[PDB]
């Protein structure tokens, strides 16, 4: 249970195992890693792209992108469930426990030629808590908050190198315990390195199976 409480020692141990001996601190509901510095190189003369990948257990793994206005998607799109999916009606304001969580957001890369930008791209979607997927607030941050930073940067004509990595406790868990987001703009004005805990205050999750126990 403790592994799905974002502030617990157990969670932090898993985080350390997944990212190495990088410094981290809890702030605004997330973990800032390595003083918010990433080694991503945005100063590369390469065409915008997205690359999704999977690991040896067929789980969504490291995703990379170079983002700019050529693949930005402002428009709307014109049964499948991710690994570990077990929906539960919660006792919190979200109403439900989990969302199909994209590694690389539709709005960011939906215009990239040939790419499966759908909600059922099996290399780009995980079981993600509603809280950690949806929260767009600076005070209590979710993945949406960081996606908004990247989106706003691209909308200001910035080139953003971006890397999103689901963090798993071990080789077999179906559901990641956190989402690692890294971003760097060519001009250096945008840079972050964070882990968004795959947690929700009103319940705990067994990351092995995705089974949720409401508080
Ligand atoms: Cl830039
Ligand atoms: Cl929450």
Author numbering: 40 to 117, 125 to 261
Original paper wording:
One such nuclease, NucA (Gbs0661) from S. agalactiae (henceforth referred to as GBS_NucA), has been shown to degrade NETs and to improve infection persistence in the host. GBS_NucA is thought to be a sequence-nonspecific DNA/RNA nuclease with endonucleolytic and exonucleolytic activity. Although this family of nucleases share a common ββα metal-finger catalytic core and reaction mechanism, their global structures, localization and regulatory mechanisms can vary widely. As a starting point for such development, we have determined high-resolution X-ray crystal structures of GBS_NucA with and without bound magnesium ion and compared them with those of other ββα metal-finger nucleases.
Because wild-type GBS_NucA is difficult to overexpress in E. coli, an inactive form of the enzyme, H148A, was used. A 1.5 Å high-resolution X-ray crystal structure of the GBS_NucA (H148A) apoprotein was obtained in space group P1 in the absence of a divalent metal. Two molecules of GBS_NucA were present in the asymmetric unit. Because the crystallization conditions lacked divalent metal ions, the active site was solvated but otherwise empty. An intricate network of putative hydrogen-bonding interactions links the metal in the active center through Asn179 to the distally located Gln180 and His142, using Asp145 as the intermediary. This network is also present in the apoprotein, where the metal-binding site is unoccupied. Given that this coil is entirely disordered in the P1 crystal form and is incomplete in molecules C and D of the P63 crystal form, we hypothesize that it is highly mobile in the absence of a DNA substrate. Residues Arg116–Asp118 along this loop form a short α-helix (henceforth referred to as α-helix S), although there are no such indications of helical propensity in Arg116–Asp118 in the P1 crystal form.
